[model samples]
Target: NPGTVDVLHWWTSGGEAKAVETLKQQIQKDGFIWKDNAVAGGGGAAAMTVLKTRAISGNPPSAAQIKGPDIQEWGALGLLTELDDVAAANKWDDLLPRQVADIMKYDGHYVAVPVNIHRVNWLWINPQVFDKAGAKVPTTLDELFAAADKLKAAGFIPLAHGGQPWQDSTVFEDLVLSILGPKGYHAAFVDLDEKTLTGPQMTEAFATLKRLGTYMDPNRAGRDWNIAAAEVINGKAGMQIMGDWAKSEWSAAGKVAGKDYQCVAFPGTQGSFAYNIDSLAMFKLKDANDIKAQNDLAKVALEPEFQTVFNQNKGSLPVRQDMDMSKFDACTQKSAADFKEAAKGDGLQPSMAHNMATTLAVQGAIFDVVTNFLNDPQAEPATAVKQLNAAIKAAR
Candidate 1:
């Protein structure tokens, strides 16, 4: 544990930054030396680019913050270090939810450590902006459309949104899930059923996304997601359809939950949980000391106390289902409760934008179609669906 372990990740924001620091302190207390290599990007795009260069040079960091199907991709390339012994001793398979454990494992081997679960289908509302627009919290897609109309009429930006490809796909997938419901969403993403991909559900989902675009800021193109979140934070906009990460921005702004702002599931998505998991993949190293540090890193990360502390700061719920959640805040408690409910109801779906639902290539295919339709008002919904289907197939 006394050996140095360097980590590469994109957790540069306030609460997210603090969360990584907490993990450092926890592991350091066990006699490990932690060196942080943080990259400042929201979607890990810049970090992934740097990682690819480092790996190609055969000098990758001790650990890399990886998630979703990308973890399997890295493992397949023989870049990730195996942590099966540590996972077995810690009973990780029994401790973590099956779906999450599956993501952390590759062909029955542990290649990464799970950290937190972020529910992505979140609607963050600044109630003051809602009040100014004389609108109520929308509970259905039809009502959401109505409320957006009222907010726009009252001269407020109805939905605070950035036009980045990932952000565009975030809202895009939620709209698809809302319109198709959980069953269809799973069939489309998890199963990749050809029928679901080219069906009316796909067409309607694209149309819904295009309809929602009318409420977006005209200058949303290239805007950062946190900046859009700030628009709602400062009361310049009524709402932002984002993930639990927005709560970190709210905390940074010194805002209190349920008083200054509110969180709800996106309309028609009450039963479904769209998840973006934060995890770390330990990279294989020739040095014995580095391997020991990586093993300790995995074990300490899953310790109960560190899990609570790290997730609380990161604005995400602890990934371990058995963890004591009493110390977490209201939003976290609600997220955990809803997550449990969704797991039971089989409504837990991976987030496409965040790379959980599909490979990066497939995710990009969906992203290109959505962003094209969003940035081009003349792009027809039918045409967008056809492009989406073709893009995904070509990628496959």
Candidate 2:
């Protein structure tokens, strides 16, 4: 009997949906039923809520999109299925980067299959908009503010931003990288050092974030991340500080990189690569056919063909380091090259806002303070720093 594999994820946007279709087709081609449970919410927060409800009810899907410490949290509950057999047969250890493989494993066994690596510190720019404003592409923090001034004078929205909590933190984390550097970033976010979290540098990061918010359009509240990307795509905005996934929006709109638009490391973050890895964790199953289907999903997800095609559509680098990159776009090629270089130093850091560097509890605390500070014009950076320190302590 053909097994039905139900997969839950939040890849409902144009390019993301197209990317997931490849996985669906592959599972179907292998004589399995593909049950897609796509919940459309940027940052997967909405999808995660549904996952919790289903999981608690003992009816979780065959696989779910989960990452970072959350995977370990789920594994601790014994709800995740072990993929050690499939992993061993496929030689995943040899194929995956050590940093990525470490995240995919729980207690020395593979619990999830990583799909792609997203460089989160990318600044997506509309070249035509910059030309219209007579603004140069910024490569440093001071330059970014100068360009924003030029863009604002030319009557263009300088920074295309979504006003949601996760979006706020995305931009905030980029600022953290620029202000704190990789070592300080690790100290505050990864190590949870209270002094660094509440220090003068963190205050400056908030102040910078508040300043960047002034360059956004007045109607940004509740706007989706992709819609904000569209602001740049249509030439209404000068730039967007977002993950490389924003590249998919440009790709879907028939925009060309380095011509129609450009992808650069965020200002003051040229050497640093803040990363987010997307992966699907398998749920425990009782049916033998369903278990077999789950194994097939794991195997096909890591295949080089799927990795190449999915990443091309989704605008992320393949997690498998051995895949050929000739088919990827110029932005992705640069990201791939940068990934290798950043790995040689402390420049390669997991993103705190994207659930790669910390647990959900701690990440949520940051989201709360960051969104509040970004939304409240009168909020002081020093006050936000203190609040952040208290929030993190309580969360811990």
Candidate 3:
């Protein structure tokens, strides 16, 4: 840990930028030099592209933020450094949630250090809109659709969607899970058997997405997630169906979670969950200093102190479930409570947005179908069903 430790991530917003500073401060305290390699993007996709290029070129950073199934993907590419020793010393296998632990591990090797968990399926609302519209917060599908109609009638955008693939996919998956519940969504989307991927169940979900796309903003093409979030922040748009990270933007603006922004499960998914966690994959290096630096960063990564401070600022939960939740803001606290409930009720689902732990070829086909269904408003539901089957046929 004697030299500069380069770290890469796509955290460029107000809250996310500040959260990175927290890691820097901690790293410096651990007797190492911190070198930040910040790359800006709407989603983490762009940052990931740069990470791949840099690592493959052998200019690998000390560590890079790659969450969900991405850890395993990088591991397969031989770009990740196994951290079994680090995990044992930290007792990570015992501390982290089971589903997440498996994602970080591949064939007994610990490829990355799991960070905070961000539960998807949140409907972030500007609370004032509810009072003004006199529409109660929706807890069921019928009530939710009715509320959207009322909000639209009141001249609100109602659903402040940005017409991007992941953004659109987030809404689609959560809505399906909330409406169809776990089993149907799993069989239709997550599991993705040849028969199920193009089945009637999937056709119905795609139809719902086309309807939801009617309310998006015109400049949504190539728009950033934070920009979509800003619509709700500025009260220009009524609500957004996004992940937990959006809360960081709101909390950074000094907006109270429940008071300024209200996060709700989709109406029909009161007791269900869809969740994801982000991680920083430690990359092995030829340079001795780089190797030492990566290990040091991995060591402090999920430490209790850093976990509490970092996740609090990032608007996500600590990797270790044992961490005390008292210090987080009202929204974060509520997020923690809901996370536990979702976990107990089997609401925790894998995220493909950041890094799906599944095969990249398999995940790619799945994402392709999702994006096509999202981008083409007139995509005949029957045609989309056929396209999906062909896309995954070549995948194992």
Candidate 4:
């Protein structure tokens, strides 16, 4: 009898759902039963709540979509199964980037298998909207505002935005990157340096974020990220600031890049890459067959065949560096090139909004301040910085 693999995740729409389907089919082909527990939240917040309840109740899924510091948090609790055996056998150290490989390991042992590397800080644009407005695609903060003015004058929604906390933080991080550059971004988010976090640059970024909000439509409150992307996809909005995952929506809609739409680095962040790596962490299980199935899932997830199809559909770069990119679209190809270039310099940074650079507690604190600031018309940037500092301090 084939062992059952119960997997929990939040990839429930567009190309993301389709991407998960490919993995399911591949696992089934390898003679395992797939038990999918897909929770439909773009930021995995809802799914994580379910995961925590299940985990604490002693019935965790075989694999749960976990990443960053949370993997170690679970591992420290002794709930994660060791994947060192699978990692060694498959030579994962040779296959993955050093930074990525480190993220998958806890206490010198592999506990998770990374799926793909998502480049955050992307601005998706509808060229048709820009053309209609007679505005150029922005490459700087000043240009972005000028274009937004033209877009608004032309009776278009200048910015497509989802007003949720995570979505708010996503756009905020892009502004942070644009203003601070990669080194400053790393200092503020990863190092959590007090001066950097409370600096004038951070306030400027917040001020810019506040300005950007005026360009969005009023119907943005509680909107989903994909729906915001759809505003651009259908040409109802001029642009959207989101991660590369938004590309999956465009791809699912049969829209072509560089023509129907364009994927560009957030204005003033041309060379920097902020990344989120999606991974599945195996949990401790009693059944021998279940363990076998868990290891099998890890192995299959890293195989080139699965990586190629899954990433092509998911709109992220393959986690493994050895995969060929000839089949990916123009946008993805450019992302791949930029990923390589950024890695060699100070331009590559882990994304804080996507839970790659900090703990969920810290991230939630940030979410609180950012979302609150965006929604409050009277919130000042300087005051927002002080609140952010207090929030982070409290969370810590």
Candidate 5:
């Protein structure tokens, strides 16, 4: 008999929760008992902490939604079950992007199954709000500020932002990429190049974040990301800088893509994409049935039947290259096209905000400086680079 497999994840929001049910239905349809262990908040932060404690207590879930280099971190701990057989049978090596596929493996063996890819550098706008403000969608930074000015004059929040530290970092990273371009963004966040971290580009990014924050709602402190997105959805705001997941909110609100809303790259991010991938890593289980269930879950996750529907609801692009993307809306068509296009150049890079570019320690350090600088009126942009470099080195 197939045994129950406990799955841990932090997808507790309206759209996120709804999206996971698609997998749950598939999981149950395959004759396995599903036990969910959902941990709210922390965007993956609290979930990972809970996972560590559970693993330490010898009661870890059968599978946990994990991603980035952290997959390798868990595999190195010897806590993961190898999925080489399942991956080989499915030809995942050929189906996935090499960079993405590499992260799902550890020491040359598959340890996790990547489910979806989220493009983070998006500007979601209400076209009606732009129309009311007598402004056009901005393609350049100069135009963006000009639109913001017009939107403000028209009495709408120019940027729908929540002041949460992670949200702050999310917008901050996009600004960094805009100012630094892909090469400098990679140097600072991925390569951790000292000069790039402490250079003019970084300093300017900090100043731009300051400028961007001025457009956010004054009551934005500690607001949830979805609520900020709703400001744009309900036409109380002009635009939001968020990932594809924000589309789930739009869809849930009965707002159609491209007509009611417009999705575009953040200013100066025309070619580059900062990506966050969601995956589930199977933990070693003592029960044979539980192990079998884990293998089944991994297999179904990548299958076209699951991949197409799952990504459609989850507001992410399917991880598998072979899936029919016809069901996806207009935003996803552009996103999927850009996903392939960016892969050909220096455009596709891991997102620092979403925990794909750095370790938790390093990410936390960067988050602290970014949030602090945003909150402190006296903070100077020129000082942020030195502070960022110091924090990065200290975290290492």
Candidate 6:
């Protein structure tokens, strides 16, 4: 008998962990222990680091939850093993989405397994809190700010934010994409222009970032992202700018979406379609047993049965967009629907900061300016613009 197949990934947040729980249960049903070796981080970068070390040590988990260009980066290292046999047998070429399939294949050989898609850039709100303040979902930036003001007046946190650099960047990006419109923001950030980073739109975007931070709680520094999610769950906060995965935490708490909570695009930033997709990429292993384990795990995850259950709880869309979505809660259905609507006619694309459209060092510098300005907007917005210009010069 083959030993248990251990998989490593970093998906320990409320929604992500719950989503993976369904997969674990499914694996158990088939009599596999499915040992999960995880190192949870705000971002998956920490887990990837561990994967590199383990692979270097010749003890990598059979499957690891990697993502994006990392598949190519790792594949280029000659460390990834081909899974072409499994891919061909399963007809993976036809089953996978275009972007995901592109990332999985390296020089005509499949090197990774994809699990699900997590879209970044959504605004989540507490229903009771919003109603108490007499605010409808904001469809424009001014309305959003006004609602934030109302929430503050009502003695609630306007926007639930944690002080992590990525968390700050996440909110900032949402605002940028929304306020600047998809065309301008994507051209500036996604297209990677030195002038765009220092441009007027970027400076104004940082101003919006400053205003948004006023809504975060005082003790938000270093707080876990889920803990920030909890603020909205308990009605202590009015809204949060987070990825779609945040719904998992509320679902786990027995809260309902659209009734207990509401979701929306930013105010005024209508037609601002900023889309992102996330999935786990499995690593190659040396041992035959480990390889078998990896293959088995990959097949199980790719199965339609696993996709539905896993994504339902994970606050993400299933990797297969055509799958039946009737079982999902109201929040999930709406999210899926919104994404579907956006995908039409040049709507879907990747995020700049979250997925390495720019180097991490460069992202950190911009984030520092934005978050610091958020901490003190009384400073001239022009000054922030100057700093951004300097950042573009340095980073480029």
Candidate 4: lDDT of 132?
96
Q: Model 2: how far is 118 from its true place, Å?
A: 0.6
lDDT of each structure?
0.87, 0.91, 0.76, 0.91, 0.88, 0.73
- Give each model's clash number: 0, 0, 4, 0, 0, 6
Q: How close is candidate 1 to the true structure, as a TM-score?
A: 0.96
lDDT of 4 at 108: 95
Model 3: residues with Cα > 4 Å off, grouped in runs: none
Which parts of model 2 are misplaced by more than 4 Å? none
How displaced is residue 324 in candidate 5, in Å?
A: 1.5
Model 1 lDDT tens row, 185-223? 988877777788878988998888888998898888878
What tens-digit string does per-residue lDDT give for candidate 6 at 47-113?
Answer: 8678768877767676776555556766788877788888888888888877668867778788877
What are the C-alpha RMSDs, in order, of all predicted structures?
1.5, 0.9, 2.0, 0.9, 1.2, 2.4
**TM-score for each model:** 0.96, 0.98, 0.93, 0.98, 0.98, 0.91
lDDT tens digits by residue: candidate 3, 1-396 = 386788888888888887788899998998889989999975566887898699888688887887765566678887777788888898988998887888787667888877788877778888788777776788876677777887787877787877667776778777667656776666655666667666776777677777776666656777778888888898877788888888888878878866788888766766666776777787878988767777888888888999988887787878787877888777677777777787786566665554453455666776677777777777787887788778777676
Q: How does candidate 1 score on lDDT?
A: 0.87
Candidate 5, run of 10 with poorest lDDT: 40-49
lDDT (Cα, tens digit) per residue for candidate 4, span 125-188:
8998999999999999999999999999999889989889999999999999999999999998
Candidate 5 per-residue C-alpha lDDT over 7-61 given as tens digits, one digit per residue, 9 for 90 to 100: 8998777778878888889989999998899998746777888888997677789
